[PDB]
Amino acid sequence: KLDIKKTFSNRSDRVKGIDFHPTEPWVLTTLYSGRVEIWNYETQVEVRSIQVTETPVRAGKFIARKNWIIVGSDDFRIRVFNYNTGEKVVDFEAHPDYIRSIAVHPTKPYVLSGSDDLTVKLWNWENNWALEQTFEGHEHFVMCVAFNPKDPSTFASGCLDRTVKVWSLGQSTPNFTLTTGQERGVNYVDYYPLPDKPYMITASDDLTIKIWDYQTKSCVATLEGHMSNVSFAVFHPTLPIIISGSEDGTLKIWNSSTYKVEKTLNVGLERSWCIATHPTGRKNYIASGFDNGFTVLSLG
């Protein structure tokens, strides 16, 4: 039963990245101001925060099994910090242009970064953060990268060139390129995590969200209702819903069978930029970052 409760919300500078820790009740936010924050959303006290840089930090993920966070910023750098001590673990120039998105492999010591330099890069932390591969082919900014959780030897990249490319690690060309028909670009791509559907979802400045069958490459559905750029759309990992967020200031919760909107939320933090869902669905938590702060919600 959908019963949305605000578990914790705080104001800050614009939140561009956000992520949940899988075992501590913590959320990481990465800010346009160069600051990152880790909050305990149950006690409502900061665990740790760092002034990383003076440029925006658009991307940040926990790497829980190593006690790290990894972040990427407009100064072209990837940094990794130990969240227990604050210590900086590594600091390197990853691309010659902004970093939009970082994904962490669930099982292997790999990280993907996607950038305005038109590539995705694969880094290996068990090989001194060596660059192991550069995936070339996109023709505008790479806005989003995400591993297929059912087969993390493959990953999807979403691009302002209006395509999604799906790639295999260790192979230089995409397995396939999806021509989205989202003419203003793709801001975000996400996989449905369960084995019953081979689905991906994309979000666009053209105000649409689209569901794809990645076996047949067909568009299964198009979800309309947002009134400004759609920054993200994801499938909830346990509940039968899709969650999206937009520069129109709303989050929307859509029924994932009927693709109809169930609930529209204006949390009143202005434009929405990023999303995370709790990996194990603890309290069905989701969190979103906005112009004016973040919010952590229990969906029921």
Residues forming contacts to another protein in the complex (CB under 8 A) are 14, 32, 100, 141, 143, 160, 271
* HSE toward the beta carbon, residue 268, CA cutoff 13 A: 3
Q: Cβ of residue 226: shortest distance to another protein, in angstroms? A: 17
Question: The tokens of 257 are what?
Answer: 């069978």
Q: Cβ of residue 19: shortest distance to another protein, in angstroms? A: 20
d(CA 245, CA 271): 8
Q: Cβ of residue 300: shortest distance to another protein, in angstroms? A: 32
Q: Cβ of residue 32: shortest distance to another protein, in angstroms? A: 8
Closer CB to another protein, residue 111 or residue 160?
160
Closer CB to another protein, residue 60 or residue 279?
60
Q: Cβ of residue 269: shortest distance to another protein, in angstroms? A: 14
Rounded (5°) CA angle 16-19-23: 165
Closer CB to another protein, residue 24 or residue 75?
75
**b/e burial code for range 166-205 (CB count within 10 A of at least 16 → b):** bbebeeeebeebbebebeebbbbbbbbbeeebebbbbbbb
Question: The tokens of 216 are what?
Answer: 């047949």
Closer CB to another protein, residue 14 or residue 121?
14
| Longest CA span, the chain | 47
Closer CB to another protein, residue 62 or residue 141?
141
